[PDB]
Every structure is written in C-alpha cells, then in structure tokens.
C-alpha cells in the first residue's frame, strides 16, 4: 500500500538525476553501441592520438596532466553530487557537518560507479562521451601512474555486467550516499530512517524493473561494501599524489 507512492518519489529523483548528471549510462553504452546517429568518438591508442586529441577536449608533463584531468572532472562531478544530495527529502534537515561527512566518504565511490557507466570491457569514455581511451595504454604508463585507473576497470567489468539502467543508479547512488556506517558522525536517527525508506523503494524497484533477474539487489549491496574496501584503499593514492612539487627540475631552455 505505502510502496505504491514512493515509486513516484523514486522517479522524482530520476528527473533530478539527469538534471544533475548530463550524461546517462544509457547514452554512454548507446554511443558505444555504434548504432547511434551521433559521430563515433576517437580512440586514444598511441601518443599520435594524444597529440591530435588534446585539441578535441604551467602543466608541463602530461603523464601527470591526465591524472589532474581525472581529479579535475572529479571536482566537477562532486558539484553535481552536492545539488543531488540537496534534492533528497530531509537532507537539508540534517546537520551541515553530517551532510558534508556523507559526501566526504561517498564521492570516490559514486564517481567510481558512474565512471563504470562510462567504462566497458576495454576502455573508457572521456569528455561527456566525445572521446575514448584504452586500458592497454593505461597499463604502459610510468609507475605508479599505470596502476591508478585499472582497479576502476576491475570494478567496471564486474558492475556493468549487472547492466543496471539509469532508473536504478538514480536511487542506488542515493542509498550509497545516505550510509550511516561512517565514523565521525553526529545525528544517527535521520540517516538510519531515510536509508530505511530508501532501501524500501530500492528493493522493489530492483524487483520490478527486472523480474527475470535473480538476487541482484543483495549482492549489489555486497558490492557497495566492496566500494568501502576501495575507499579503504584510496589512502595510498592520496599520498602518491606527491609527485608534483619541488622536484629538482631546472628549466633554463623550456
Ligand atoms: O576532460 C574530461 O572530461 C576527462 C579528463 S581531462 C583531460 C584528459 C586528457 C586531455 C585533456 C583533458 C580525464 C582525464 C583522465 Cl586521466 C581520465 C578521464 C578523464 N575525463 C573524462 C571523465 C568523465 C567523467 C568523470 Cl567522473 C571523470 C573523467
């Protein structure tokens, strides 16, 4: 009886989703189907394509500049995640430090999954679908730059297999956002109750959109906890960032 209404509420967030996320998974996999009216984006196999691809988008080296690109488009994505989380009923009624804490620990995970929406078996989409780069080239970068994005693939091959459509991610990223099992938290009640309702809606949205599917919900939550593993493992990265300041390089001619 109650669930009948929230579906609408669920779909409400769907609207804000595309209003907050300009590129949907359906359009990513679509532009990667080849059966699309739009032009096929260009691959990035070899440095030739890099030289001719920076056009279709202080820095000096580029093996760093790519990394700076990933994190830059990340700080662009968070600006979508802010307003999205705002559009969650009750979200602004929680404590400001509690909300910034919620996004504090979830951002890398949700950009992980969205990137998985732009990912595939071998490669990823760049610049709102206008580009495509390959993992094989990614393996060949100077260490540790070669190992930065591959785990992302190691998640995309597992996640995109469930082949969720945007109507599921629109609220799944909400349930990952409103997670109550984080340290340094203040108001316990609101995240518990709202995550309960969220889990109510998500349950039978999952069960409704795919009746042939067998227990995608549960194991997918298990993959949420796997995303928690990967935030446990981002501590290394945030320190490998230390390759970009005062490094005994003199530029007399450059
Ligand atoms: O300009 C971009 O949109 C982009 C960039 S930025 C860029 C990259 C190469 C030449 C010029 C800019 C980017 C960089 C990396 Cl190493 C990986 C993915 C990247 N992307 C695509 C991207 C799309 C979505 C998200 Cl969340 C993160 C990255």
Swiss-Prot record:
NR LBD domain mapped to chain residues: 5-254
GO molecular function: alpha-actinin binding; arachidonate binding; chromatin binding; DNA binding; DNA binding domain binding; DNA-binding transcription activator activity, RNA polymerase II-specific; DNA-binding transcription factor activity; DNA-binding transcription factor activity, RNA polymerase II-specific
Tissue expression as described in the entry: Highest expression in adipose tissue. Lower in skeletal muscle, spleen, heart and liver. Also detectable in placenta, lung and ovary.
GO CC annotation terms, alphabetical: chromatin; cytosol; intracellular membrane-bounded organelle; nucleoplasm; nucleus; receptor complex; RNA polymerase II transcription regulator complex
Keywords noted in UniProt: Activator, Biological rhythms, Cytoplasm, Diabetes mellitus, Disease variant, DNA-binding, Glycoprotein, Isopeptide bond, Metal-binding, Nucleus, Obesity, Phosphoprotein, Receptor, Transcription, Transcription regulation, Ubl conjugation, Zinc, Zinc-finger
Annotated segments matching region Interaction with FAM120B: 1-47
Regulation: PDPK1 activates its transcriptional activity independently of its kinase activity.
Amino acids binding rosiglitazone: 71-74, 108, 234
Cross-link (Glycyl lysine isopeptide (Lys-Gly) (interchain with G-Cter in ubiquitin)): 19
Disulfide bonds: none
Swiss-Prot/TrEMBL induction comment: (Microbial infection) Expression increases when incubated with M.tuberculosis or its lipoprotein LpqH; induction is TLR2-dependent (at protein level).
UniProt PTM comment: Phosphorylated in basal conditions and dephosphorylated when treated with the ligand. May be dephosphorylated by PPP5C. Ubiquitinated by E3 ubiquitin-protein ligase complex containing FBXO9; leading to proteasomal degradation. Ubiquitinated at Lys-19 by TRIM55 leading to proteasomal degradation. Ubiquitinated by E3 ubiquitin-protein ligase STUB1/CHIP; leading to proteasomal degradation.
Subunit structure: Interacts with FOXO1 (acetylated form). Heterodimer with other nuclear receptors, such as RXRA. The heterodimer with the retinoic acid receptor RXRA is called adipocyte-specific transcription factor ARF6. Interacts with NCOA6 coactivator, leading to a strong increase in transcription of target genes. Interacts with coactivator PPARBP, leading to a mild increase in transcription of target genes. Interacts with NOCA7 in a ligand-inducible manner. Interacts with NCOA1 and NCOA2 LXXLL motifs. Interacts with ASXL1, ASXL2, DNTTIP2, FAM120B, MAP2K1/MEK1, NR0B2, PDPK1, PRDM16, PRMT2 and TGFB1I1.
Entry's disease: Defects in PPARG can lead to type 2 insulin-resistant diabetes and hyptertension. PPARG mutations may be associated with colon cancer.
Description of its domains: The 9aaTAD motif is a transactivation domain present in a large number of yeast and animal transcription factors.
Name of the protein described by the UniProt record: Peroxisome proliferator-activated receptor gamma
Taxonomic path: Eukaryota, Metazoa, Chordata, Craniata, Vertebrata
Residue numbers of the full-length protein present here: 234 to 497 of 505
């Amino acid at each position: 009886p109650e669930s009948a209404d929230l579906r609408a509420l669920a779909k409400h967030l769907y609207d804000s989703y595309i209003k907050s996320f300009p590129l949907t998974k359906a359009k990513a996999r679509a532009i990667l189907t080849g059966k699309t009216t739009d032009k096929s984006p260009f691959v990035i196999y070899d440095m030739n394509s890099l030289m001719m691809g920076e056009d279709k988008i202080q820095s000096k080296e580029v093996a760093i500049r790519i990394f700076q690109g990933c994190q830059f488009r990340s700080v662009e994505a968070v600006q979508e995640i802010t307003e999205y989380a705002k559009s969650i009923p009750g979200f602004v009624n929680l404590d400001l430090n509690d909300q910034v804490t919620l996004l504090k620990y979830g951002v890398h995970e949700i950009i992980y999954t969205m990137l998985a929406s732009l990912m595939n078996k071998d490669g990823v989409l760049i610049s709102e679908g206008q580009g495509f780069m390959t993992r094989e080239f990614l393996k060949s970068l100077r260490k540790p730059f070669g190992d930065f994005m591959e785990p992302k693939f190691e998640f995309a091959v597992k996640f995109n297999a469930l082949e969720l459509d945007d109507s599921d991610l629109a609220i799944f990223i909400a349930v990952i956002i409103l997670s109550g099992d984080r340290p340094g938290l203040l108001n316990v009640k609101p995240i518990e109750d709202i995550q309960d309702n969220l889990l109510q809606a998500l349950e039978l949205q999952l069960k409704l959109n795919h009746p042939e599917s067998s227990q995608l919900f549960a194991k997918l939550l298990q993959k949420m906890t796997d995303l928690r593993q990967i935030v446990t493992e981002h501590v290394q990265l945030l320190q490998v960032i230390k390759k970009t300041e005062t490094d005994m390089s003199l530029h007399p001619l450059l």
